Amino acid sequence: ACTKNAIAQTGFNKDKYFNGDVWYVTDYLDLEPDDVPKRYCAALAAGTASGKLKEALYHYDPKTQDTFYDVSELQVESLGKYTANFKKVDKNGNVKVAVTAGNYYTFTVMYADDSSALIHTCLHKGNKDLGDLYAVLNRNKDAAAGDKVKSAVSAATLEFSKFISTKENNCAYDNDSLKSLLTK
Ligand code: HEM
Ligand SMILES: [N]
Hints:
11% of the residues lie in helices and 42% in strands. By secondary structure, it is mostly beta strands.
């Protein structure tokens, strides 16, 4: 279960964050570390489509090769805090799993600037009991975390040394597919 009520960045600039570009997860912290320790790759595109706030997600396990995409329409809880009901789709936007009540994630933008961000996310999916997940994002897939985001992590009373990096996972991303999914 999730246990944190993350606080959104004061003065969060929604237009800059939801500009349709891609964000790559470079480091993450799972508060409920599973028993199965494996590498992982994730990226997302957030933007507006016909006035609606949307988010496209990509998950890739470099070991098992398990891959999946998701598209969600976001609902606003407050500035910087959203609730997303996701639908699983293929890379072309074709629906594989329709939106289902009870299947959603929340996400809070704790810090963000033109190239980096720190977010908190709580996933709710079926019977699986998931926990809080923090992620450091960057507009560049190979960028080391800068002083700005590292300080934000500290300011949130978190220890960056505990975060797991995805840089050595040999990740590959289909940016074009991610961007196109925003309209699906
Ligand atoms: C950047 C923020 C992320 C968001 C918003 C997010 C969101 C989600 C969503 C919505 C699903 C369900 C997809 C579906 O069933 O169609 C999912 C599943 C999953 N995510 Fe993430 N994720 C993110 C980052 C990550 C990262 C970095 C990891 C850590 C390695 C991760 C590991 C997983 C795993 C293992 C599952 C499968 C869980 C299951 O179905 O049993 N996610 N994620
Ligand atoms: N996740």
